[PDB]
Amino acid sequence: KTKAVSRSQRAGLQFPVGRIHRHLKSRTTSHGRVGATAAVYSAAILEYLTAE
DNA sequence: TGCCGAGGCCGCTCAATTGGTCGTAGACAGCTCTAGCACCGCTTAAACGCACGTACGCGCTGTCCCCCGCGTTTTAACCGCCAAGGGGATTACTCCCTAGTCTCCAGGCACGTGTCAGATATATACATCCTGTGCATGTACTCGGGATATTG
Incomplete structure (x- = not known):
C-alpha cells in the first residue's frame, strides 16, 4: 500500500501501457502477452503520432 | 526630286488574382465532473522461456569440361517525323427539373436487458491411424531417322 505509479509514467x-496490454491479450494472438512487450509497443505507436 | 506611306514609341479601360476587413455562428476547448470501473498493488501457484556438449547434416570447398555468351556488320523496316483535313470535343447561352432544406410524423428495429443450457472444454484410458522406412517397374525421357509443313 504505497500509492500507485502508472506503467505509462514508469516507461x-x-x-x-495498461490498456494496450489488455488489447494485445484477446487480439488474434497466442496465449502469453509479456508485459515488457506492451511498453515497446506503446512507444512504436506514439512515435508515429509525433512523426506524423 | 517630291510626297507619303509605312514606321516606331507612350496614356485610357477593362479583367483576373490578392490581399484586406466585417460580423456572426455554431463547434472546440475545457470544467466539472462523480461516476465507475478499470489500473494498480499484492499475493499465489502456477508455464514456459532459456543458456548450455554433442550427433552429425549439410553448407561450402578444389578439381576439370564445355555451351552460351561475346563480337561483327548488313540490312531491314521500325520508328520517328510533318503537314492537311474533318469533325467532334468545346463554349456560351436559355430553359428547365430536381437537389437540397425543413418539417412533421411513425413505428421498425436496432438497441438494450434477464435467464441460465446446450454447448464445448478438460481428464484418463486407449486403440488406431498415420508416419518413416524400405522396396519393384513403368514411364516419361533423350536420342536418331524420316515425314510433313512453311518460309522466301
Whole structure:
C-alpha cells in the first residue's frame, strides 16, 4: 500500500501501457502477452503520432 | 526630286488574382465532473522461456569440361517525323427539373436487458491411424531417322 505509479509514467510514455496490454491479450494472438512487450509497443505507436 | 506611306514609341479601360476587413455562428476547448470501473498493488501457484556438449547434416570447398555468351556488320523496316483535313470535343447561352432544406410524423428495429443450457472444454484410458522406412517397374525421357509443313 504505497500509492500507485502508472506503467505509462514508469516507461516515460504518454500512451496507455495498461490498456494496450489488455488489447494485445484477446487480439488474434497466442496465449502469453509479456508485459515488457506492451511498453515497446506503446512507444512504436506514439512515435508515429509525433512523426506524423 | 517630291510626297507619303509605312514606321516606331507612350496614356485610357477593362479583367483576373490578392490581399484586406466585417460580423456572426455554431463547434472546440475545457470544467466539472462523480461516476465507475478499470489500473494498480499484492499475493499465489502456477508455464514456459532459456543458456548450455554433442550427433552429425549439410553448407561450402578444389578439381576439370564445355555451351552460351561475346563480337561483327548488313540490312531491314521500325520508328520517328510533318503537314492537311474533318469533325467532334468545346463554349456560351436559355430553359428547365430536381437537389437540397425543413418539417412533421411513425413505428421498425436496432438497441438494450434477464435467464441460465446446450454447448464445448478438460481428464484418463486407449486403440488406431498415420508416419518413416524400405522396396519393384513403368514411364516419361533423350536420342536418331524420316515425314510433313512453311518460309522466301
